[PDB]
Every structure is written in C-alpha cells, then in structure tokens.
Design a protein around this ligand. Sequence first.
Ligand SMILES: CON(C)Cc1ccc(O)c2c1C[C@H]1C[C@H]3[C@H](N(C)C)C(O)=C(C(N)=O)C(=O)[C@@]3(O)C(O)=C1C2=O
Ligand SMILES: [Mg+2]
Ligand SMILES: [Mg+2]
Ligand SMILES: [Mg+2]
Ligand SMILES: [Mg+2]
Ligand SMILES: [Mg+2]
Ligand SMILES: [Mg+2]
Ligand SMILES: [Mg+2]
Ligand SMILES: [Mg+2]
Ligand SMILES: [Mg+2]
Ligand SMILES: [Mg+2]
Ligand SMILES: [Mg+2]
Ligand SMILES: [Mg+2]
Ligand SMILES: [Mg+2]
Ligand SMILES: [Mg+2]
Ligand SMILES: [Mg+2]
Ligand SMILES: [Mg+2]
Ligand SMILES: [Mg+2]
Ligand SMILES: [Mg+2]
Ligand SMILES: [Mg+2]
Ligand SMILES: [Mg+2]
Ligand SMILES: [Mg+2]
Ligand SMILES: [Mg+2]
Ligand SMILES: [Mg+2]
Ligand SMILES: [Mg+2]
Ligand SMILES: [Mg+2]
Ligand SMILES: [Mg+2]
Ligand SMILES: [Mg+2]
Ligand SMILES: [Mg+2]
Ligand SMILES: [Mg+2]
Ligand SMILES: [Mg+2]
Ligand SMILES: [Mg+2]
Ligand SMILES: [Mg+2]
Ligand SMILES: [Mg+2]
Ligand SMILES: [Mg+2]
Ligand SMILES: [Mg+2]
Ligand SMILES: [Mg+2]
Ligand SMILES: [Mg+2]
Ligand SMILES: [Mg+2]
Ligand SMILES: [Mg+2]
Ligand SMILES: [Mg+2]
Ligand SMILES: [Mg+2]
Ligand SMILES: [Mg+2]
Ligand SMILES: [Mg+2]
Ligand SMILES: [Mg+2]
Ligand SMILES: [Mg+2]
Ligand SMILES: [Mg+2]
Ligand SMILES: [Mg+2]
Ligand SMILES: [Mg+2]
Ligand SMILES: [Mg+2]
Ligand SMILES: [Mg+2]
Ligand SMILES: [Mg+2]
Ligand SMILES: [Mg+2]
Ligand SMILES: [Mg+2]
Ligand SMILES: [Mg+2]
Ligand SMILES: [Mg+2]
Ligand SMILES: [Mg+2]
Ligand SMILES: [Mg+2]
Ligand SMILES: [Mg+2]
Ligand SMILES: [Mg+2]
Ligand SMILES: [Mg+2]
Ligand SMILES: [Mg+2]
Ligand SMILES: [Mg+2]
Ligand SMILES: [Mg+2]
Ligand SMILES: [Mg+2]
Ligand SMILES: [Mg+2]
Ligand SMILES: [Mg+2]
Ligand SMILES: [Mg+2]
Ligand SMILES: [Mg+2]
Ligand SMILES: [Mg+2]
Ligand SMILES: [Mg+2]
Ligand SMILES: [Mg+2]
Ligand SMILES: [Mg+2]
Ligand SMILES: [Mg+2]
Ligand SMILES: [Mg+2]
Ligand SMILES: [Mg+2]
Ligand SMILES: [Zn+2]
Lengths: 214, 122, 62, 120, 114
Amino acid sequence: ERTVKGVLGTKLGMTQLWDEHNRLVPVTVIQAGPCVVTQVRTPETDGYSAVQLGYGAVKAKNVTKPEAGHFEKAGVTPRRHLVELRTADASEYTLGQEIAADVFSESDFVDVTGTSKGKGTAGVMKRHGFGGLRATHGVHRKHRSPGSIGGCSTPGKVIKGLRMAGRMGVERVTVQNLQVHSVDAERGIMLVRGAVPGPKGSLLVVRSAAKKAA
Amino acid sequence: MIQQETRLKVADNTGAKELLCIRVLGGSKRRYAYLGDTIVCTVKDAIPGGNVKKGEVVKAVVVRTVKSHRRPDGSYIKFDENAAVLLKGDGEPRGTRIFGPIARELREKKFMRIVSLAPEVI
Amino acid sequence: AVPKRKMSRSNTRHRRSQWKTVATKLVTCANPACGEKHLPHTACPSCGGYGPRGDRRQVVEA
Amino acid sequence: PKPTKGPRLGGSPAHERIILRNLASQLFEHGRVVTTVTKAKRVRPLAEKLINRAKTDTVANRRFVNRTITDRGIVHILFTEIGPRMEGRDGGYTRVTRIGIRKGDNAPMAVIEVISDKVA
Amino acid sequence: SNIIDEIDKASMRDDIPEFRPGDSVKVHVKVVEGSRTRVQVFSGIVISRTGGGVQESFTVRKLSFGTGVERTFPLHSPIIDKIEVDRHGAVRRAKLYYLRGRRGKAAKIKERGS
RNA sequence: CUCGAUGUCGGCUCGUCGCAUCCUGGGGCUGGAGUCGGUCCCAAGGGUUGGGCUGUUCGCCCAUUAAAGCGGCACGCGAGCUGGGUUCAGAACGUCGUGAGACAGUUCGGUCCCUAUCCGCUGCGCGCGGAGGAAUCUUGAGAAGGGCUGUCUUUAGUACGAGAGGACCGAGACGGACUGACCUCUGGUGUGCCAGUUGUUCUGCCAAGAGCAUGGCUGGUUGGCUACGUCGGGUUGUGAUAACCGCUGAAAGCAUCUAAGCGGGAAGCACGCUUCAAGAUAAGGGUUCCCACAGGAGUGUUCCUGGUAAGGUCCCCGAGAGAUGAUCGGGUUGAUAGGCCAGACGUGGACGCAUCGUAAGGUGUGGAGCUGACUGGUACUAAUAGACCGAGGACUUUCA
RNA sequence: GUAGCGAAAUUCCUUGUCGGGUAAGUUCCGACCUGCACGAAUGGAGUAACGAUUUCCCUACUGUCUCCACCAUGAACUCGG
RNA sequence: CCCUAAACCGACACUGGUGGAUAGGUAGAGUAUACCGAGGCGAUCGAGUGAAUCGUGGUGAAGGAACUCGGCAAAAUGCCC
RNA sequence: GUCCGAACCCACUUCAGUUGAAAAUGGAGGGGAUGAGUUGUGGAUAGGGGUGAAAGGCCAAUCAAACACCGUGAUAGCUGG
Ligand SMILES: CON(C)Cc1ccc(O)c2c1C[C@H]1C[C@H]3[C@H](N(C)C)C(O)=C(C(N)=O)C(=O)[C@@]3(O)C(O)=C1C2=O
Ligand SMILES: [Mg+2]
Ligand SMILES: [Mg+2]
Ligand SMILES: [Mg+2]
Ligand SMILES: [Mg+2]
Ligand SMILES: [Mg+2]
Ligand SMILES: [Mg+2]
Ligand SMILES: [Mg+2]
Ligand SMILES: [Mg+2]
Ligand SMILES: [Mg+2]
Ligand SMILES: [Mg+2]
Ligand SMILES: [Mg+2]
Ligand SMILES: [Mg+2]
Ligand SMILES: [Mg+2]
Ligand SMILES: [Mg+2]
Ligand SMILES: [Mg+2]
Ligand SMILES: [Mg+2]
Ligand SMILES: [Mg+2]
Ligand SMILES: [Mg+2]
Ligand SMILES: [Mg+2]
Ligand SMILES: [Mg+2]
Ligand SMILES: [Mg+2]
Ligand SMILES: [Mg+2]
Ligand SMILES: [Mg+2]
Ligand SMILES: [Mg+2]
Ligand SMILES: [Mg+2]
Ligand SMILES: [Mg+2]
Ligand SMILES: [Mg+2]
Ligand SMILES: [Mg+2]
Ligand SMILES: [Mg+2]
Ligand SMILES: [Mg+2]
Ligand SMILES: [Mg+2]
Ligand SMILES: [Mg+2]
Ligand SMILES: [Mg+2]
Ligand SMILES: [Mg+2]
Ligand SMILES: [Mg+2]
Ligand SMILES: [Mg+2]
Ligand SMILES: [Mg+2]
Ligand SMILES: [Mg+2]
Ligand SMILES: [Mg+2]
Ligand SMILES: [Mg+2]
Ligand SMILES: [Mg+2]
Ligand SMILES: [Mg+2]
Ligand SMILES: [Mg+2]
Ligand SMILES: [Mg+2]
Ligand SMILES: [Mg+2]
Ligand SMILES: [Mg+2]
Ligand SMILES: [Mg+2]
Ligand SMILES: [Mg+2]
Ligand SMILES: [Mg+2]
Ligand SMILES: [Mg+2]
Ligand SMILES: [Mg+2]
Ligand SMILES: [Mg+2]
Ligand SMILES: [Mg+2]
Ligand SMILES: [Mg+2]
Ligand SMILES: [Mg+2]
Ligand SMILES: [Mg+2]
Ligand SMILES: [Mg+2]
Ligand SMILES: [Mg+2]
Ligand SMILES: [Mg+2]
Ligand SMILES: [Mg+2]
Ligand SMILES: [Mg+2]
Ligand SMILES: [Mg+2]
Ligand SMILES: [Mg+2]
Ligand SMILES: [Mg+2]
Ligand SMILES: [Mg+2]
Ligand SMILES: [Mg+2]
Ligand SMILES: [Mg+2]
Ligand SMILES: [Mg+2]
Ligand SMILES: [Mg+2]
Ligand SMILES: [Mg+2]
Ligand SMILES: [Mg+2]
Ligand SMILES: [Mg+2]
Ligand SMILES: [Mg+2]
Ligand SMILES: [Mg+2]
Ligand SMILES: [Mg+2]
Ligand SMILES: [Zn+2]
C-alpha cells in the first residue's frame, strides 16, 4: 500500500567523514550499482504490486537456461541477484528499466536490509545476553549455564519460546532511518551514515525510510 | 567513567580532599558518570581547616576523568586523575577556586562559573 | 540421567538404521595403460600417476 | 605466514611451529615427503616463503633462512639446487597430491614435493 | 577496496608536516565558544600515531598544573588549524606510553641528532 | 496421597501468569483557587535502581528514581548453582537430670553424586510428498518480536489567585534504561608480526642465530572477535472499544446516553513497524526452461526395468558460512585459495660496511630490515579427471 | 554468691540502652546493669608471646563484581579403530 | 631378571604407596627452580576441526569488594645487602 | 619441643574427580621440618579383650564390642513369596 523507492547494492566497507558541523560521521560505502527491472508484478496477473530488480555481475557459463529465458523475456543481460521491492507504484516501472543510485538524493532517510554476520552455535550468554553465574563462591561447573528453564510439577514442562543456545546470525535484518550522506551515480557509490548488517561483499537492499524520518 | 564506590580527588578549595561516589544522578540504573555529570558523594578525607567535614554527603560535578571522552568532531580527551568539584545545590561551586585543567564539556551551557574559575579549559 | 524404560524394537531400529556409511565412489584412471579405479583427486594406487591422459605426472613410486 | 585459525598441530602451537619447521626442512632434504593432507597444506606457505627468500643468494639471506631450518646442509641445498631451479618461477614452488588414507587411523595422506622441472 | 581509498582522498589533507611520536608539537585546535570561535594551542609530546589513510590519528600529552592531559586528534580533522613541530625527539618506541608514569627529568626526551 | 526416599530456608540464573495497579495512559466525584492532592472507576503494553545491617524471609536505614506494586507457579526454579541457616557424628557455655544424657537455648566446625532413554524446549539436518521433471522470484493462512521514560526550553508568569504561587491542552531540544545491527572511531584481546631482555643449552668459533623456561618475561600491535565503543529503533498513526462524556428519544403526554440509531472516548484489543512462514498434505501464485525416450511384461494403458533432456549432486579450491550435516562462492571458457609482485597497516632503524669509543656502546649508510589476516594485480601451484541422480506428455472426472 | 566479671561461646525478652565506627552497622569495640539462667582449681579475672582457630576494621591489591570480552589447550564435536 | 616399577603392595600393563646407596655442569644460599651432563625416554589408540559448554592456564579499559554468608579464589607482596 | 625453607611427615583452604587415574586421590597454595621428629627390620599386647596426647578413635578397605566356624534351617504377633 506504501510507495517505496529502492535499489540494490553491495557492502564495500566503512570509513568516516566530517559533516558541515565538523562532526565525525561513520559512513558505510554501498556500491549501489545499476539495477534492471527484470519483472513487474501487477494485481491482474500476480495479485500485488512489486518490482523485481536484478543487479549483479554474472558469468555467462553460470546462468542456466531457465534464468537465461527469464532475462531474455526481460530484454536485459543476466544479473546475479534478483530481489523484489514491494512498491505501490510498480506500474510506473517498465520492463528492463534502468535504476541507479541517483534514485536517492543527498539527505533522504533510508532503510537498509541485509543478512547479518553469522556466529555459529552461540551460547545463551552471547546470543541472549544471559547473566551467568559467578566465577567463584562455589559455583560448580555452571559458570555460563542458563540457570533454570522452568518451574516444577506445574507446568511440568518447558514453555515454548524459552531462550536457549542455538545458531545466531545469518538472518534478515533491516536497519532504519539511516540518512544517506552522498550519492555519486557516475560510479554507483552511496555513502550512508551508519552501520548496516552483513559482512563486506554482501547484498544490500536500500529502500526509502518506512517511517519517513525520526 | 565514575561509578558507585569510585574515589575522586577534589578540584575545589573547600578543604575536601577525597570523595566517594554514592550515586550517579541522571536516571535510574545509570552506571557511570562522565565529564560534566553530577554525582552524590561522601567526603572521605578533608583538610582539618575547612568548611567541609569528613562523612558529609555533598553533590559534585565530575571533571577530569581518567578513562577518555569522545567529542563530536572525533577527537578524544583524557586526564590522569578522576577529579570533581562540589556544588551548592544550584549548579554553583561551593569553593571559590578551581585547580588543574578542566574539560570543555563543562562549558556546555551549564557550568559557566566553574569554566570561568578554571585555570585551564582543555 | 538413566534410561527409564527399555526402548522398543521399533524405536531402537529407527535410531540404529541411521548408523551407516556411503559407498566410496571411485574413478577410472585416465592412464590408458592402467584403466584402474582410484579415488577422485588422488593418485592412482596402481600406476602411481596423476593428471589427464595427456599431462600425466608420477606421484607414487608404486 | 597466515596463522592456522583452528587448533594447532601436535597439541600445542609451539609444537606446531617445530613440526612445520622440521617438515619444511625434510621437504627440502628429500625433494618430496608424504605427510598427510593438513600438514602438507600447512607447510606449503612456509616452504614457498623460504624458497623465494633463497631464490636470491646473499649472506644476509642465508642467515635469515638459517633462522628457520637451522641445518646448514639443508640451507646449502636450498640455496644451491632449489633456489636456482626457480629462477623464472613466480611462486608455486611446491605441489601437493593426495595419495589415499592410512589404514591405522584413516588419516588422509598426501605428498608435497618441490617442483623439479625448470620453468624455462 | 581502493574505492574506499579514493573516497577517503576527498577528506584527507595535504598540509600535514612530517613528525614522529617523541616530537614536541603544537596543535592549533579550533574551539567553538557560542557565537565566537578561537584557536587554542595544545602543546605537548606526541606519544602515539595510529595510522591508516583518513583514519590516521595522533596523541599529544601535556603536563598542565601538575596533571597530565592527553588529547587524541584525527590527523585530517577539520578542527585542527595547523600543526607545528618544535623538537624532533630521539626515541626507540612507536608508542610512548611509558611517559604516563614519568615526571621530571625522567620524563624528558632527547633531541634528534644528539 | 508418598516412609522398597515426593531433598525442606534465603540468594543466584531463567522466566511465565493473575490483577487485588507502584509508575506511565484514560475518566467520574471531590471536602477539585492555581499548584497539588484523595477517593474509586477503566487499564496488565512496557517499566518497576544501587547499597549498609542480618544466614535470613521480614524489617530498618543510606542515595536515588516516573516508580522502587502485591501475589501464583511443590512458600516457581539444588539430575541449574549456592550450603550461610536448618537437621548427623566433635566441642564449649547456660539451664535441666544422681547419672548416661536433654534443650523451637546459644556458640565454633562439619562430604552436595548422576555420560539424558521418553516427553518438553533451543537449534540444525536427512527423507518423502506437494499428479511431469526443473530453475528462480514470491503471496501470507498463521506465528514471533517490539510497545519504558525523564529533565530542560517554549506557549507563559498566560489561565487561576488577595497575594505568594502557578497551569491544562500543544511545540522543540537533550537524556536514562532497554535493544538490533555493526567495527569507521575509542577500549580490550592477541600462542602472528616486529622489538628489547634474564638464565641456560646449542648451531666448531667470531659474527649471525636457534631450542626451553607461562608466548620465559617485558614494550607495542594490523586482521578477526568484541563492549567500555558508534549508528539505528520504540513512534508519528488507523479501526473497534473499557470506564466515562454525549446526541436524538420513547415505553411513562414530561424526563432519560437507550429501549431504534448515531457520535466521541486509553500506553489496553486488532493493525501500523520488524522477523519467520505453503508439512497452509488446503502443500499456494507469477515468470522461465526441458520435452511425447527405449525395452519387457501387460489386460484401458496398467506397472517394473534402462539410457537421457532441463537441472542437480558427488569430488576438488575456499569463506562472507559452519559442531557435523547445511549455506554461499569458485572449479582452467578460471582470480577460489596459496604463492608471487606492489601497497597499506604493524614494529622502529636488520645484516653488512664505514667511522667514533679502552669497552659496554654511539653515529652514518637508511623510515632501514622484517612482516599475517587488509587492498590491487599476476595462472606460478592446487582447483586433475570423472561418475551418479534426474521427466515423458506427465492418474482419473467434469467443465469450458 | 564474696573478690572479680556481666546483653558474655552464658541475656529469653533483644536489633536492650547509650557511645564509637559507616553516606547507611541485627555483626564489631568500649560502657550500663534490669545476671530469664556469671562467679572463684568442673577454677574467677587478666595476660607479653603463639594460632592453616572464631570475629570486626583500615590499607594495599586485584575479573569478586559493574560486565564481561578475547587467546591457547584436555574433553566435547566429525572420521577410522 | 624387575626393583623412587608395566614384573613388588593396590582385582589392571592403575596419575597411589614402597626402605637404602650413587647423584656431574651453569645460574643459585641450596639436594629449591631453570636449562643441561652420565645415562635414559617420546608415555601403550589416532587424524582432524577457530560450535555451545566443562575443565586448565593467559591478558584487560575505567572503577576497586560495589561480589559474597564470608575478600572464597585470584591479585599484590616476595630475594640479598 | 627457636626462625625461614626442600627432602621427609602432615592434611588447613580451594578447584577437579566423584560408573574417578585412585573403594579417599590429583592440581594450586598450606602446617611441622634437631624434635613430644620421622622412618626400616624383628618383636609384644586379642574381642567384654587390647590399645587410645581420649575422637567411642583404632585393632587387615564399614568396630557402642573384630573376623571365621559352630549351636543353626536362631528367632521375628512383622514384610515378601
Ligand atoms: C545436617 O543435616 N543434614 C541434612 C544431614 C547431613 C548433612 C551433611 C552430611 O555430610 C551428612 C548428613 C547426614 C548424615 C547421616 C549419617 C547416618 N549415620 C550417622 C547413622 C547414616 O545413616 C548414613 C548412612 N551411611 O546411611 C550416613 O551417610 C551418615 O553417617 C552421614 O555421613 C551423614 C552425612 O554425611
Ligand atoms: Mg559474570
Ligand atoms: Mg570452575
Ligand atoms: Mg506432564
Ligand atoms: Mg522417536
Ligand atoms: Mg586467529
Ligand atoms: Mg587431537
Ligand atoms: Mg614454548
Ligand atoms: Mg605507522
Ligand atoms: Mg520407588
Ligand atoms: Mg481491574
Ligand atoms: Mg508486569
Ligand atoms: Mg493481554
Ligand atoms: Mg527482620
Ligand atoms: Mg512474581
Ligand atoms: Mg520452594
Ligand atoms: Mg529440580
Ligand atoms: Mg553449615
Ligand atoms: Mg542442609
Ligand atoms: Mg569462661
Ligand atoms: Mg547438676
Ligand atoms: Mg554451624
Ligand atoms: Mg547435562
Ligand atoms: Mg499473517
Ligand atoms: Mg500450523
Ligand atoms: Mg579495521
Ligand atoms: Mg587497541
Ligand atoms: Mg635441548
Ligand atoms: Mg611471572
Ligand atoms: Mg583490530
Ligand atoms: Mg435528557
Ligand atoms: Mg442527557
Ligand atoms: Mg646496528
Ligand atoms: Mg546489641
Ligand atoms: Mg538474642
Ligand atoms: Mg548503635
Ligand atoms: Mg571454693
Ligand atoms: Mg568448682
Ligand atoms: Mg559453671
Ligand atoms: Mg580454665
Ligand atoms: Mg580465664
Ligand atoms: Mg589475650
Ligand atoms: Mg589452628
Ligand atoms: Mg576499604
Ligand atoms: Mg580434543
Ligand atoms: Mg568413533
Ligand atoms: Mg630405576
Ligand atoms: Mg604404577
Ligand atoms: Mg598388580
Ligand atoms: Mg653456583
Ligand atoms: Mg628439581
Ligand atoms: Mg644423553
Ligand atoms: Mg628405566
Ligand atoms: Mg596401558
Ligand atoms: Mg570442531
Ligand atoms: Mg593472572
Ligand atoms: Mg597486551
Ligand atoms: Mg581491570
Ligand atoms: Mg588499569
Ligand atoms: Mg586502590
Ligand atoms: Mg557488601
Ligand atoms: Mg549485594
Ligand atoms: Mg585466599
Ligand atoms: Mg598469587
Ligand atoms: Mg622448630
Ligand atoms: Mg617415604
Ligand atoms: Mg578436613
Ligand atoms: Mg566438589
Ligand atoms: Mg613454627
Ligand atoms: Mg608378631
Ligand atoms: Mg560423644
Ligand atoms: Mg578398618
Ligand atoms: Mg554384645
Ligand atoms: Mg538348638
Ligand atoms: Mg523363619
Ligand atoms: Mg511391604
Ligand atoms: Zn592408474
């Protein structure tokens, strides 16, 4: 229902800048490269309004026949990635249209979505901030234990949703209201004030800020 | 960073020589006091000739932390001793003199009198 | 902790059937004079050679 | 070169250092060595660093190589035979090839060997 | 990547003098005073230079009123009007952290070429 | 009920639920100038501090805070921890007993095990199905998370009040706590890197080094991991409502918030925000690709074998991934890793030589040498070579 | 029931009362005596020295803690026995 | 023939117990400790892999007992003149 | 029956172990260490007895009366079958 502008990019890393109030600002560098409209979704044929964007450099021998046919119908060269943008203005998008970082101006607030860095199987003390037990005073082989995990004969069970150890990281995380610092479209570079999820080289979705601003 | 039980020296001439942080004002559960934060202290040691007695509960503003202090321009300031300056309950010093360097964060519209009496504002 | 009850035959077999191994795959030696089966990306134990029909290199003196 | 990330060979990092240095020395002594996959792949970077340092023969370089190895006979071999053998090679002075497994403990085995043929 | 570096080149400055930790330095730091601005000189000894592109920063230690004050400045910060080098020290360490616990004659640095 | 054992106080950890609400939200009546209160209706979304004393619960006190709620869950939680108290054998004191001994009197000391089978729960795979086999992108039935709050400025010294005093409803700024991601900054780490150095043994010796002593010990320290670090977040709202305030209006010629109906009305309810999600067997939808193979039995073809297409897996090189599976990238049509070359970071002036000093050593040659992770190049090395799986016009019925 | 001692390893009431120490002290330290239920070889009251005894305080010191992070290792984990 | 032990006492080829003699060098007060000698060993399942977690060590910003029944453990101190 | 401190003897604290390496130990500290010391060999004291710097401690890995055999197929208003 909401109209969203969007673009796809790659997390190149971070550096720092100084703003006009001489304030040090951390900036993430996103190679908000050229994206092409591979497919437009309409209520008539698909049931919702969204725009599928491409983006990515792919080797010709690593694109299969179904993907090649999809891109041939789109009328564009094959791209590595394909990500949709749920926008209510999908129609205004034509098949094969060119999208560049200049879709965002010098002070727009954006939401950046990416897959967070993985940590493997994490303990409770790390993946949930559990305070363990003391290091001394008789603590017996339970320094990083989760403590109790329930009650007693009532309910004689462990409630669903209890926080215990497990695999943390590698998940969809959206960080909101990041003010774009600068856009240089002729080389497809975006400087966004903040820290975005994911390791260097990961795919990032930069969309217009859902909550507009602070 | 100044927390409960941290002992600080005094940059005033009130006669107090050492304070013990009893609390860090500014909200519940607050851990630490930084440059320009107000704390409740007890006077562990004082000069025998002075207007402050040992065991007196006072309020002070923290100047000269040891840890570090970031500034919006990306620079940092660091001292070699945790200091504090006593207050009269209205934001004004109890003493009539300030000793040693004073942080610039005291001159955030708040402690004008202390900054004026500061021998050096860094 | 200790096993409260003797596990049933069905459950014991359900768990035990998963203790198994996969067969080693083996690949035909590229050397025409050998034609034997060896592990992939591994020198042929018979000819003691490695590489494609053309650029073969001796690896094991066997 | 790059550290080993995971747990070290021989049950101790000091023992891993000793193992890698001795294994490189034995590689240079014998031309080739069968030393299981992980040891060979971990000794390859150090051995190639040493060979590259030995590609140019100076007294200072010989002393620096003798910091490792520590057998001057092997240092002489490295600076006289292995070194000049790689005049035109830009790295890649060694190669690793898998052999199979050990019956006793199923250790995947491999032979690492210094390149023998001249690049020219 | 080098894209990061070429972006950093837009923020890096060129009028930085050459100096090492152990050198006496006056940093002309710009101080904002409400409507006013001023240039205040921080004079001291460089005790550290944490390097790397636009991230380069250096630490200056001063002894004022019986207390030591350390200030860390990003080498390309726009708050620094300029940097003056007074003495070139003769030290043996990259980081002069031992000077924190030294005062008096034990805390003074030899001059270069002495 | 349990004595062929249901371990008994308080704290720690982890929560969850009730509302008989401590704070924050809303409203009536007030014995409600203002400011505040005090009553008792709504309301459980979130929040509800750190210490001194005592084994304590309780309680008192100190300093805060928007507030320091009350209770249930075997007085939650010892196959999670604690053993200070209690309730073993030792001993002492008081009291009692002739005595052995006794004491909800006191005191000092005092062993507490478990490799998880089943359910439960947090994670992660394999299989099969999803009426052909695949590749990609998805809808959201439904599920989860999130929901705190202060101070100051302004409206305004306005309203009110005799004064002193001092607003509501709005606007802005800056915080605390909590929390998501993250490593540019700061801090920590550092079994790598550089450097110094003690003892000792060794490389014949000099020179230059090596082993061991916790990395022998020290001084630093990139990458990675991280918080003490820096960025973001709670919301601005919508709908139906609670108490409550109403409009029109009878029964009952009036009146009445109500009987017909309509409107306002809270941090609560459902959305909004974030995340999972078609095993949603109701197994979805779009787009794209591959195609009517072969041989047998057959009994409407049926069904079973066999080679393939699209496609995928094994294997190998790896990390942005990871306990293992998995995931992602690369596999010569190749920069996937190592090496190599250059750079940056880090250390801080190598060896040799010259010169000065009796010597330890100093200076020069020379930001030297060394050097990992980061960056850019470069096929030099290894990603050889190959196998294996995988449809068939894809069941039937009716429609068009 | 004397000397002496006393809320004591004895004091139930009880966290007695006052004083010291702490920002805050049911413990401690010195006093009071109202000794539930001290007391003179089952010794009374003291005592330098001594104590892996019990108790309180100050200082130094620290991952005990605010608040944990990171490193290496023996198990755990994967493969073979 | 073993004999501060794989052969003895412990059910074991068991991190336990077992009397006496010899016992070099350097640093050292030392028969402590470190590295070595005479001499003897590489230890009687391995190969891997940065999971959580447990054990065993290491380091730590600022604070410094706020931990806790209790400074439990650790740190600091440490030698000679 | 001095002090510090190895051997030696001990066993205060803590952690680990607790189907252990071990039916009482191991790591880290800790007490004594010329003495009422410790240790080897042989010997003496025997069950209502021993011995005990005294804990009902110890007397062949469970002692408020050892172990073995015998009376004996003790007895059990009790539990089981
Ligand atoms: C402070 O109250 N707590 C809750 C109790 C308690 C606490 C700590 C302990 O360490 C012991 C005990 C109980 C006693 C019981 C003794 C008894 N015996 C004396 C008759 C007995 O019957 C046996 C046995 N073998 O059956 C034992 O174990 C026993 O001797 C023994 O050692 C004990 C303990 O260890
Ligand atoms: Mg902790
Ligand atoms: Mg432990
Ligand atoms: Mg049940
Ligand atoms: Mg089952
Ligand atoms: Mg590493
Ligand atoms: Mg191993
Ligand atoms: Mg070592
Ligand atoms: Mg540098
Ligand atoms: Mg039973
Ligand atoms: Mg209610
Ligand atoms: Mg609640
Ligand atoms: Mg509810
Ligand atoms: Mg009480
Ligand atoms: Mg509760
Ligand atoms: Mg209970
Ligand atoms: Mg339980
Ligand atoms: Mg007890
Ligand atoms: Mg008990
Ligand atoms: Mg007495
Ligand atoms: Mg009597
Ligand atoms: Mg007791
Ligand atoms: Mg367990
Ligand atoms: Mg839904
Ligand atoms: Mg369901
Ligand atoms: Mg970095
Ligand atoms: Mg650092
Ligand atoms: Mg040696
Ligand atoms: Mg040491
Ligand atoms: Mg780093
Ligand atoms: Mg009416
Ligand atoms: Mg009305
Ligand atoms: Mg030199
Ligand atoms: Mg009292
Ligand atoms: Mg009492
Ligand atoms: Mg009192
Ligand atoms: Mg008498
Ligand atoms: Mg008498
Ligand atoms: Mg008596
Ligand atoms: Mg007596
Ligand atoms: Mg007496
Ligand atoms: Mg005495
Ligand atoms: Mg004692
Ligand atoms: Mg103290
Ligand atoms: Mg292991
Ligand atoms: Mg196995
Ligand atoms: Mg012997
Ligand atoms: Mg033995
Ligand atoms: Mg035996
Ligand atoms: Mg000597
Ligand atoms: Mg020794
Ligand atoms: Mg020898
Ligand atoms: Mg022997
Ligand atoms: Mg054995
Ligand atoms: Mg592993
Ligand atoms: Mg330590
Ligand atoms: Mg360090
Ligand atoms: Mg610290
Ligand atoms: Mg410190
Ligand atoms: Mg201190
Ligand atoms: Mg305390
Ligand atoms: Mg506490
Ligand atoms: Mg201790
Ligand atoms: Mg110590
Ligand atoms: Mg003595
Ligand atoms: Mg002995
Ligand atoms: Mg004991
Ligand atoms: Mg234990
Ligand atoms: Mg003594
Ligand atoms: Mg005899
Ligand atoms: Mg007794
Ligand atoms: Mg016995
Ligand atoms: Mg009898
Ligand atoms: Mg008879
Ligand atoms: Mg009978
Ligand atoms: Mg019965
Ligand atoms: Zn062959």
